[PDB]
């Protein structure tokens, strides 16, 4: 499941939580995948997509809001965008989800 593969990534690999950190990663060319909450404002969505296109990074839209994405990643705070820097254990990068 998508939550399960996200949990594996959170417990094994490298991730950054938040818009500023994920933009920094996209600028530095470190990200592989970006999970964007369905609640994110559309201007931020389009800006993140433009950054990911320029950086050749995959974009996946999470189903759910900030609360759902935060609790899925396993934190007690709302999370809007997660960037995957390393997914050495989990296979979330290749799956269609």
């Amino acid at each position: 499941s998508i939550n399960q593969k996200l949990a594996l990534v959170i417990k094994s690999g490298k991730y950054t939580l938040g818009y500023k950190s994920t933009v920094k990663s996209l600028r530095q060319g470190k990200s592989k995948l970006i999970i964007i909450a369905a609640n994110t404002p559309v201007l931020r969505k389009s800006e993140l997509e433009y950054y990911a296109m320029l950086s050749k990074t995959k974009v996946y839209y999470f189903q759910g809001g900030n609360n759902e994405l935060g609790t899925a990643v396993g934190k007690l705070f709302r999370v809007g965008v997660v960037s995957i820097l390393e997914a050495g254990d989990s296979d979330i990068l290749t799956t269609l989800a």
Binding site: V23, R27, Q28, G29, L54, S55
Partner: protein, 134 residues
């Protein structure tokens, strides 16, 4: 990894917000003077006015005037684009030591101004010489 020399970005903060600049030198590590990932960039302060077939010779010459600027910019204050512009004509003049002298800034701005005017007259990069409407 795409913020390099020759890339065209859009300034989103500061007095030149809304202008299009080209990165001449990216310092991703930063420096002692600017302890943040920044970029020496050159841009256009006053775009050349859009001319037509009717305009006379003197009118075209006076409407094709460009005011450039040079600035060190934080990466967070740039909206990088997908476009490229040849920076080699002023890579030597636009440098770290230039910004420490108001007169050297003036001479480097002369160089950048004439380069941009030549490119605009040749007809290259009409988007880069086009003004953003926001």
């Amino acid at each position: 990894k795409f913020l390099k020399a020759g890339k065209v970005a859009v300034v989103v903060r500061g007095r030149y917000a809304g202008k299009k600049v080209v990165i001449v030198k990216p310092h991703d590590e930063g420096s002692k003077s600017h302890p943040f990932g920044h970029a020496l960039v050159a841009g256009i302060e006053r775009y050349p006015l859009k001319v037509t077939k009717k305009h006379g010779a003197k009118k075209v010459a006076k409407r094709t005037k460009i005011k450039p600027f040079i600035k060190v910019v934080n990466y967070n204050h740039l909206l990088p684009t997908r476009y490229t512009l040849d920076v080699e004509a002023f890579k030597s003049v636009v440098s770290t030591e230039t910004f420490e002298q108001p007169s050297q800034r003036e001479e480097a701005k002369k160089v950048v101004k004439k380069a941009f005017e030549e490119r605009h007259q040749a007809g290259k990069n009409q988007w880069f010489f086009s003004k953003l409407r926001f």
